[PDB]
Design a binder for this molecule. Sequence first.
Ligand SMILES: Nc1ncnc2c1ncn2[C@@H]1O[C@H](COP(=O)(O)OP(=O)(O)OP(=O)(O)O)[C@@H](O)[C@H]1O
Ligand SMILES: Nc1ncnc2c1ncn2[C@@H]1O[C@H](COP(=O)(O)OP(=O)(O)OP(=O)(O)O)[C@@H](O)[C@H]1O
Ligand SMILES: Nc1ncnc2c1ncn2[C@@H]1O[C@H](COP(=O)(O)OP(=O)(O)O)[C@@H](O)[C@H]1O
Lengths: 587, 600, 62
Amino acid sequence: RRDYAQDRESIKTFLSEFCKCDDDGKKEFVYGSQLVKLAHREQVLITIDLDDLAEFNESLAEAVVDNCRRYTSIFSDVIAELLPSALDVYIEHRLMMEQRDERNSFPSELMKRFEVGFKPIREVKAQHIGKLVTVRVTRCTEVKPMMVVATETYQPVNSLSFTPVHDCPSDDCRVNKAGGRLYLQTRGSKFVKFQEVKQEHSDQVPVGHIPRSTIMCRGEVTRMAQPGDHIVVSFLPLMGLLFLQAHRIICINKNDEISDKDPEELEELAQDDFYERLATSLAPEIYGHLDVKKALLLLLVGGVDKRPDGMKIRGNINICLMGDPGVAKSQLLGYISRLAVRSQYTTGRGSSGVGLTAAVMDPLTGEMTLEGGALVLADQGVCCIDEFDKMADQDRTAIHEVMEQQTISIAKAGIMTTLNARVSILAAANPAFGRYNPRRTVEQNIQLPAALLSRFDLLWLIQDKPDRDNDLRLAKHITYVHSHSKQPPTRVKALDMNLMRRYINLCKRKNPTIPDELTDYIVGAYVELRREARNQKDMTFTSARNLLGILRLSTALARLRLSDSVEKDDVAEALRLLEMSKDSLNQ
Amino acid sequence: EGEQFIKDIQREYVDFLDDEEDQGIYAGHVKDMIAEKSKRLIVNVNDLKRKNPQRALGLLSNAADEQLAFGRALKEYASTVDPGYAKMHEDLFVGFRHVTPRSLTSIYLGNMVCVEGIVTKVSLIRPKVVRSVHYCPNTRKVMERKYTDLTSFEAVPSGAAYPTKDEDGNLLETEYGLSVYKDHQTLTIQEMPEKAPAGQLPRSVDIVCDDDLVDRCKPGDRVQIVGSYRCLPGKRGSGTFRTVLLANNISLLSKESLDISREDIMLCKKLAKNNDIFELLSKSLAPSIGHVKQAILCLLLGGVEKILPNGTRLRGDINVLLGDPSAKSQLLRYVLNTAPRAIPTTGRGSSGVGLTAAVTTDQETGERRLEAGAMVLADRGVVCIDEFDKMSDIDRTAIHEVMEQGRVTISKAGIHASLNARCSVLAAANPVYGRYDQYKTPMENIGLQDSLLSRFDLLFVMLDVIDSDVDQMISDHVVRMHRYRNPKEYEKYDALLHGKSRQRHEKILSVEFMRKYIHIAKCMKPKLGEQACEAIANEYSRLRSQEAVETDVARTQPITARTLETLIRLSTAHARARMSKSVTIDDAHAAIELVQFAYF
Amino acid sequence: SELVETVQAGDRYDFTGTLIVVPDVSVLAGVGTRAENSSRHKPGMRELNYRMAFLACSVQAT
DNA sequence: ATTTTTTTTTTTT
Ligand SMILES: Nc1ncnc2c1ncn2[C@@H]1O[C@H](COP(=O)(O)OP(=O)(O)OP(=O)(O)O)[C@@H](O)[C@H]1O
Ligand SMILES: Nc1ncnc2c1ncn2[C@@H]1O[C@H](COP(=O)(O)OP(=O)(O)OP(=O)(O)O)[C@@H](O)[C@H]1O
Ligand SMILES: Nc1ncnc2c1ncn2[C@@H]1O[C@H](COP(=O)(O)OP(=O)(O)O)[C@@H](O)[C@H]1O
């Protein structure tokens, strides 16, 4: 019931005089800047805010929140009329030799060149038609053409279905029979990109209910989400009178500034130069155990790779762990799986996965859906399985070919499936009946081939026997976090996981080297392995890649010391951790 | 405007809206200034019989057309009093003989009557649309054409697509945010089957719902629901006839509400200082039962939740079972019947723990069965089953999963899902050789597996001998059972004494007084003080050092510190049995005798 | 016809291989030109995508 | 999409 025209004048006054000097450096014109940036014809899609119209006036700040449609075509045509300075070039060729007024006059959408969106399920109640609202992906789909007008008759659509026309609804073929045929002149047809995809977070689903899941986005906005992203999306039914169009995909978790690798920290980075405080802020939940945390912090570190002679090198840390007392190695895997960007979790078996990749395993229907699981998807990341020992004997071959890297072949259906297994792995298992009898040796106490125990860079049994004082410490430290809420008091200033990953991001692209000085030294130190272990054939086996492991950890650590200078210090800790990996069952 | 009697009908309805019934009871600042907007001002027919009985029948004889008029009367009144509750000029229905679904014989057509039955085939939501709000960007006039269907009135438009190019061929376009719409629902009803006749196949019924009436319950519950009748389609000019009954309000009957204002909290606060109510409270799950139950207290109470700042949380729950055969299959019943929605299950079954596997090999409709779990109804609930000794090893894995996490995480082609659960569960037992418990060995006289030490939360004892001294004791208590079973200690009156030398009274020994301290009891948060850590640490040290020796080492399998979570969050459940905003040395004492009864 | 049921599995031949096409009734994945011999305009339809076969007239089991 | 069927694999003590 508002007037549809004088509002145009008001928003011209909005768009012109927008030089709000709220910060030093805005005495110039802000939407004049965006205006003239459209004069660069870089931006083919413009942006709107609530704080924009909060100042100018308050009607339309909620006059348009209800329609968000007709206001927007007038927003289109208004600044389409404004010239303050492929198809675009072809039309001039089409109108190069050019009732000159009685014409199939173009709609402004046919010369699109620019676009707009806007900014401000269970709870969504069914009285939201036409309102532009927000809610916080499954079955990700692909991108295809979607029309806006076919041509030169214009047959514009807002619907999703259509039908072709015949002859010409103009004056040329009106009363006079003299006329020609009419067909889709693509070179002058106007389309738009298109993707489609379908469910709730499960943190707001009722106890006695089941998580239910439709999103339609066209144009430039496509490819702004992946299967399985926790997203925010910024209502129109679809022609007994029995879907949604979006503009933006914001994720406070799993998005560009929260994600690693997808400067801001400089004020603190100049203030912060340290390697040990990570343990103080990486999982404060448990007292002690600096080594296990720092070993995983190395797996968080990364930064080791080479592609020489056509072949790569395995440059991800693959740690395994066996042991089961009061160890609580469940909070660690959960901790890593939480903070680790692009994380995963499977168990020893559970259901629909079996802590594995994908399989064509029966009489149900007919799909041949390879169904990529956790082990499939964790690449460029870590798939954190628990109790791998109980997984399965037949399964051990699946970890065998996937160990090397990027390699999971499935010759069961008649296809060369790859799945590119680039995933770092964390294996956690328990001793058999009994609790790691120190006398009962490895593969005497457990029953897994040495093919898989070997192919771990590190194995790290962790055991704590009876100490009258030690568990007391374990008592009071835990009780701190319950009588209170935050474990570490006046010791170090722990770091938020967001900041933690922020600093972590500044460690992945570094390409550390290794002067020749260590070429001799490392091979001399490694020699000790092949002498004092191999001197008795009742000792652990050794791999050709075994030294390459401590190599890998060394060079990785320079990602977090960066300066390309692996010194005697970046392998001295390498050996420190390697030797600390072992010699715990003698004492 | 039909025949002009409609207007006097309106006025006869509005003649209700004037005096002490209206001025004191009915609406205004009883719904409206409480800011609800849920239109339905609840009606009772007996008043209509009392004031205008002919108009107590205008409904029941012709329910096609009393209705827009009821809405008129209401909107007129509320507009007369409150222009705030006035900008939603819609239909605005209101509240308002019960035969069976087996007992609709051509008739009650036109009648607003009651039928009882089960929910089943609760289905999808759809909108449905009211008007078309057209605007002409040439001439720029926001014009309108309402729609309708029989499902509200007799009136229907040319119910069809949005109109256009009809006024002039002008610039002609819709608008949204203006053409409002209606919440639509569909489902069907079955009788309550316990009555059901063995010779026939019982009938279902079909219904329709609307805006504020959308499904506060689930298919397979039972509620009293009232409805009028219509029947829209043709019969062979076309195709034969099929009907439905509708125009409804809602109830729900099989709950507890609870004559519970703030007095009942005053009661729970009244008996508070009575200290060892623990006694009766433990005698509140064994009147017909030796033994334990003070330990089942917490599994009745669920648990507690605690979260790290800027981190994550902990699963909180307790699960225990143990002995010799012949009280186990008639003990669990105590908790199928009393404590809210705590659901036992089969013991050896699937298609209902958590598993879907798209099992639609019959009908093959739209939905692919993405929900066949009856352990997520145990979210913040309680469960017990049998066959644990006979349990599949398929799920022992799955329970290893649960006890560690308490979430399901399945991606078998329906979807890669995960869903909260905060549950507990109980068990059965069968040692393959009977009366062998310790002399041969403590553990594994039983036929079991030993991954599950820390994953349940207590080890206890249950044993038996028919005896010499307890022979006549068994005799006399079994008889005192058998006649304290019985009246004066119909077909059977009340039995008191030996609940009278016991100085209780069944309205202090009672169900509602029992759960008097549940529902606020299960909403408290009594943090710890300054004392547990010390002694619990010394005594867990002593537990982890010296409980594994001296002829009981073989009955000392489960020592972990994962007990120390249990060792303390039981005193939590106890601490929410009295609302003491602390936990004490006395609670320390009361939260170790577990250890003594286990073997001591 | 006079060649009918005068055969059995396991023989060797020199047939006539006079290949001809299907005069289809409907097609699936035949998304080549979709059209019809339809007159022009001034003051359900059919489609066309075929597949091959063969035919014969003469036999010699060898 | 379901009805009336059949094997060829999928994975085994
Ligand atoms: N003759 C050789 N040519 C190339 N590389 C060698 C040779 N001898 C040893 N190596 C090195 O020794 C390492 C051996 O461990 P490796 O990763 O090869 O196990 P693997 O051979 O893959 O085990 P399997 O072949 O049984 O799967 C290799 O990384 C390889 O680089
Ligand atoms: N202390 C007791 N209190 C109450 N009832 C008892 C007691 N001792 C024995 N009984 C009676 O003995 C009967 C034993 O058979 P019961 O129904 O308990 O089998 P069950 O214990 O349920 O078997 P399971 O526990 O293996 O399922 C019980 O019905 C119970 O009433
Ligand atoms: N050093 C420690 N610091 C803090 N908590 C600990 C420590 N050791 C054990 N815990 C306890 O262990 C519990 C988790 O045990 P868990 O790691 O699940 O055992 P497992 O790894 O065998 O599954 C936690 O509730 C925690 O209170």
